[PDB]
Design a protein around this nucleic acid. Structure first.
Ligand SMILES: Nc1ncnc2c1ncn2[C@@H]1O[C@H](COP(=O)(O)OP(=O)(O)O)[C@@H](O)[C@H]1O
Ligand SMILES: [Mg+2]
Lengths: 754, 788
DNA sequence: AGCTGCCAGGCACCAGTG
DNA sequence: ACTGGTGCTTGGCAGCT
């Protein structure tokens, strides 16, 4: 099997599916890797069925493997960041290609969603911001330079792709980006003086073109993401807030599972992008807010219609790549048919941004009509076999179809004519590839076959014959069908030619429809869930009246206790004592989630929120080394515009070391950084802090003991906690009474010295 | 909805719905000709699970019947997909002859494939046990029983409380768990796989006694040491009924049951098992476990046995001494024995298939190959001076007579299945040879008929062939076919060839097919007859496999003790553990750097150590290695140390630092005795500065002064280093660290006394906390330190 | 060597002949 | 009530290329 070997050497770094009957086949180290990635057997040999190939390609590319398909020669390759087939993608998750590299000056980073054409670059200023961007964008495939120094950033990632340095050269990158966009320079995209970033974008674009071997006319723009434009969140914070993924790895019990009731897959993906990148420009935020208020009375009417638009964005990528299949055009048509209704419903909405979305959404009446006429109501999945183009669209096609129908009409009549003549009630006409059309008589009747019948195939219980009249009309059927099939294919290709000149407008429409989806959904969410519009103030501050945690209030069936928060430059830090038991943690996270939601333009779970500018959110909530590392990161990077949530640091080391660290951290956050800080602690000794320094106050959670249990209440109250509950929980858990009694004595002994 | 009374159904569906009612909650494969077939919701589910088409079966009454199916010869692959997903499937076969049946042929469910009752090699993992279990809860405690259907190993026990019952589920990890409908403590059992809610009657004591005595051929169960154990018997009765119902044959490999008493083994709680990473690491994999290091057995049955031992340390001094002795005596013999032992294979599971009468031709061939190793193993073991080894050598037997039978009965490399024949060797049965020689002159006769008919007709395209649908034929090309003899009777027409039959060839067809069917049926009869001749010897065969498996474990443990530099431990009268130069057996193999060996001295006078030292200093590892050395000593293995003396250990408890921690601490305080080894790892959590520590202090006191267990108490609370002065039986040790200015170095060496200091600030600095913050923390620390 | 379609063997269904 | 045709799952392989 030397034929496999020399073909494997052609792409030695990619799994090679090698076709062999009804299977694709892998050998040597490819078999091993594949066996462990897919739950299939070894023999070294693995095999995957042919009819399920797209399924196994979906799994492999979701796990970061490129795959070459060999049918010999390599005739198809799929890579994880460059797929655009519906079978290979998850409907409600973005799938990005990215490239990274590094200067002595700093980093360059670029991402592309090959379906939507959304192309971004950035130049992260340091290791931490780069790590945060990688986690946020979570690229399915990641191109990096050979000489990349900071390998620890990307080492554990799926879909890594080591690239030569010359692919990151600035002059090549500019020339190529300018060619792609039809520009002389990149000034119009605001990236002309971002060379670190452009280098990454150029390597990425070169790779994307190499995987497709096709123009990418849907990639018409690039945008730079600046640090000051967004609320920075590091990976640990992103994880701890459970924005789109929970701490266990799933999608339930997240902020998105409550807020994302979008109706299109493109709307879902956009909302999730917004949730992970809160914007600091209140001008954008005020517009989003005003749109959410103005769409309130319209969501019931809009959503059912919007649902029918579908994933127009991903459908348009396939038009751009000329891979769109008959049902993609039928879905595009169906979306066009929703537009007059959406336009009519949106006409009376009092909002400049809704009216702007309405314009941008378009109408495309002439494309609607084209597809109504050109394609049948519910076409087949593939165009390969025809039955796609509607009658009345092309006179030549209708004619070939008529001649085919008349020849098949004739043969059906021949069947009845031959049965009648022969008196043979089993006689029939059929068709297959080997014999073309044939007359079949059963075994028991077949000795009465007329003598002109020419025997051609004996079956266990039948005989098949031809006569010249059968072959005559066979040829009428096959040549007519063949002509019609080839004509359907040419008419279908011509639909691409008529649609593609409108691609830029179509992309704008789908982007508008996706944004409408998001904003109509946030509007329904706000109204349904009793949210309020936050206001922005000039200086750091968070003033919340009856705030709630937006996830916990919908998932638990116990009543949610709403709470106030008052943070300002004069009251910058709260020391939170009392039992934790989830209540402290929830009160802290709900603070971050309210800040996050305000800063995506959403209403918030509260009676009232006023909020100042926030640059970064740190959430050290949820080994001692890992707590101290995360604490270090907060102290090194927080500013007076930062929101810091800290959860009982000092646990995991000695009493006096932990108290000493917690006290130092608190002072540094209060007096040097001046962040707005919620500082949950178990140390009663830390409640003396308000007496020793300005801007610091005590609050606490308490418990109610009753019957034979304890109710940990979630009401945040002024002042220090005056009780501990560890021994009460120990008694309820069955620790022997004599042990509890001795612990109570040691406890008073220990506490009475302070 | 159609009213589907009995009379509204066709004869086929009446039969089918009756068999389905026997198995209402599980998939039913209903044999219809070449297809196992499913209907209604079974079809829809099978379609989704097995990725086969959902179709339908027409009805004259009106509602179409959802249908799906698979050809009978592909059943095994589909059974694998189902059982891997925890699904049971009832297999219904055709019993009757359709030619002599008016209506539908007689159909029976002949077996039910379930996750814990599989015995087929393709459905099992080689190196892992696959148990069925049954569990029952009383007002006072639990009954539990386990069966390994592929070996016949049958056990009962009566775990006294919830924590011990949890430990037993973790240890035995049943693939299928039968539980009584009135089970209260559902937290132990829900979200386990293979869960099977059973009616209470299946746990009735008198029925259990009746069925067990019937299975064993006994009047009572006194001789098995379980007559006394009704709680356990109720679970074992449920289990045995399930085993019988699933297999629907006799089960002669299940010849005994044994009670697992608390006193016979070291009971490790759930946390201990998980924290010592015996067979599973903390993140769920098989890597970097104790087994990954100690398991270099060469047979699957040895690999499974060793893992059972690691999980169940034995308290019987004599057994331990015998195992130790065996390991010492076998050390220079491991290289010779291991290649030969490897050739024995998984005789254990082959013998189960023999007992169930499902053993395939390559099972019997591997059985033969195993018998052929026994004389060599006997010769190698004769010279080993050790009574326990000679007792194993004896128990492994020889079976010369059965070896000879398989050598004569079966060919060198038989096919996978017996259904197509070609298994029984020539010379074994003269009638078979006769029938075969008929389908043998065959090949030659057809070539001669061909050349003769070709030369005689003068038609150079003439060929003789066979088709399964149409039979033997003489073929002539279409262009030459008009020239065929008028005598040639047309059989099958093709596009470009005509095929004919003549009386001579038809006669030859009838005798070759008659004789092929005869030879096949005779083969199947003789193959079944091999079972009849093997099975009388099953008891000695099973004891042989068990001896072969134990030899493999012990020979392995000898090789490990040599290669990893282990030593033989000794046992003392009273609780205590004296280790010189002890190591963590796993950590020393994965670390890419020297393991720092450490002492330990526990005795009734020095029974609790408060262990301090910096985070990352080696506190947890030091505790774990103590328990691992104990565990290894108590399976009969040599241990990672220069010297070990160890007293009796009844139990090992572990708590690695809300309601759960507290509850687990109380169970330890309620259940440890003076013979317990207790590992408390940074416990004591409260809501304020001192409540958690206060509790840890009081728990320590209770362990030291009332219970008197041997306790390793690792803590970050320096306040507890004051315990030794207050409390008899308690001492300080610590994990050494050095501070050379900027940084801290972890020496990993255990020293007597408390650390000079705690090192929280230094660990924080190491973690990256800004120097200016560490500076202020040190200032606050000096204030705090001036209090006393 | 690749692609199409008959067949395996049960049983009920269905339409023509009592 | 018979007689003789049809249908239905998936995997094997003859029968064509
Ligand atoms: N005796 C030893 N020799 C070498 N390395 C050790 C030794 N004991 C522990 N270590 C290493 O030190 C690390 C920390 O050990 P650990 O037992 O977790 O300390 P602690 O529980 O005090 O925080 C472990 O990963 C282990 O690899
Ligand atoms: Mg530890």
């Amino acid at each position: 099997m030397q034929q496999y070997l020399r073909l494997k050497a052609q792409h030695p770094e990619i799994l090679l599916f090698y076709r062999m009957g009804d299977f694709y086949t892998l050998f040597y180290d490819d078999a091993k890797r594949a066996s462990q990635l897919l739950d299939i057997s070894l023999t070294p040999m693995a095999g995957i069925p042919y009819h399920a190939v797209e399924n196994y390609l979906a799994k492999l590319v979701n796990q970061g493997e490129s795959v070459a398909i060999c049918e010999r020669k390599v005739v198809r390759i799929v890579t994880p960041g460059t797929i655009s087939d519906e079978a290979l993608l998850q409907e409600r998750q973005d799938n990005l290609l990215a490239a990274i590299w590094q200067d002595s000056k700093g980093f360059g980073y670029a991402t592309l969603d090959i379906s939507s054409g959304r192309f971004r670059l950035s130049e992260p200023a340091d290791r931490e911001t780069m790590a945060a961007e990688l986690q946020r964008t979570n690229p399915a495939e990641l191109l990096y330079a050979e000489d990349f120094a900071e390998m620890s950033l990307i080492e554990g990632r799926r879909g890594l792709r080591r690239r030569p340095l010359w692919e990151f050269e600035i002059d090549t990158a500019r020339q190529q980006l300018n060619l792609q966009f039809g520009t002389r320079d990149l000034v119009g995209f605001g990236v002309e003086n971002a060379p670190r970033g452009l280098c990454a974008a150029g390597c990425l674009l070169q790779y994307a073109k190499d995987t497709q071997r096709t123009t990418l006319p849907h990639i018409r723009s690039i945008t730079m993401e600046r640090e000051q434009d967004s609320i920075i969140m590091d990976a640990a914070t992103r994880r701890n807030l459970e924005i789109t993924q929970n701490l266990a790895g799933g999608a339930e019990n997240t902020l998105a599972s409550v807020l994302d009731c979008t109706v299109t897959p493109m709307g879902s993906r956009m909302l999730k992008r917004w949730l992970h990148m809160p914007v600091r420009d209140t001008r954008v935020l005020l517009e989003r807010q005003q749109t959410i208020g103005a769409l309130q009375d319209f969501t019931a009417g809009l959503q059912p219609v919007l649902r029918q638009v579908g994933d127009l964005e991903r459908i348009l990528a396939r038009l751009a790549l000329r891979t769109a299949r008959p049902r993609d055009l039928a879905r595009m048509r169906h979306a066009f048919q929703q537009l007059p209704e959406l336009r009519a419903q949106l006409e009376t909405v009092d909002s400049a941004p809704v009216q702007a979305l309405r314009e941008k959404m378009g109408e495309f009446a002439e494309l609607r009509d084209l597809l109504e006429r050109a394609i049948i109501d519910t076409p087949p999945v593939l165009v390969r076999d025809g039955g796609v183009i509607a009658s009345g669209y092309n006179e030549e096609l209708d004619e070939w179809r008529a001649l085919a129908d008349g020849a098949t009409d004739y043969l059906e009549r021949l069947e009845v004519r031959e049965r009648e003549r022969t008196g043979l009630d089993t006689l029939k006409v059929g068709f297959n590839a080997v014999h073309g059309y044939y007359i079949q008589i059963s075994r028991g009747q077949s000795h009465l076959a007329p003598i002109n019948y020419m025997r051609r195939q004996t079956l266990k219980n039948a005989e098949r014959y031809i006569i010249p009249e059968l072959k005559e009309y066979e040829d009428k059927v096959l040549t007519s069908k063949g002509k019609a099939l080839a004509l359907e294919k040419q008419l279908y290709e011509e639909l691409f030619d008529l649609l593609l000149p409108h691609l830029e407008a179509l992309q704008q429409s789908a982007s508008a429809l996706a944004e409408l989806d998001v904003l109509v959904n946030l509007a329904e969410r706000a109204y349904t869930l009793n949210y309020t519009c936050p206001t922005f103030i000039d200086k750091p501050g968070i003033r919340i009246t009856e705030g709630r945690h937006p996830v916990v209030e919908q998932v638990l069936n116990e009543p949610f206790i709403a709470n106030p928060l008052n943070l300002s430059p004069q009251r910058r830090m709260l020391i939170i004592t009392g039992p934790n038991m989830g209540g402290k943690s929830t009160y802290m996270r709900q603070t971050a989630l309210i800040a996050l939601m305000a800063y995506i333009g959403s209403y918030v779970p509260a009676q009232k929120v006023e909020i100042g500018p926030i640059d970064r959110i740190f959430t050290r909530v949820g080994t001692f080394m890992v707590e101290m590392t995360e604490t270090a990161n907060i102290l090194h990077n927080a500013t007076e515009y930062s929101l810091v949530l800290m959860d009982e640091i000092g646990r995991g080391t000695s009493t006096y070391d932990g108290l000493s660290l917690a006290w130092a951290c608190a002072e540094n956050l209060a007096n040097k950084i001046k962040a707005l800080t919620l500082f949950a602690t178990h140390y009663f000794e830390l409640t003396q802090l308000p007496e020793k320094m300005e801007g610091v106050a005590n609050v606490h959670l308490d418990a109610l003991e009753h019957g034979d249990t304890i109710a940990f209440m979630h009401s945040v109250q002024d002042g220090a906690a005056s009780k501990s509950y560890g021994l009460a929980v120990a008694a309820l858990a069955g620790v022997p009474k004599e042990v509890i009694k001795r612990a109570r004595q040691k406890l008073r002994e220990l506490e009475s010295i302070s």
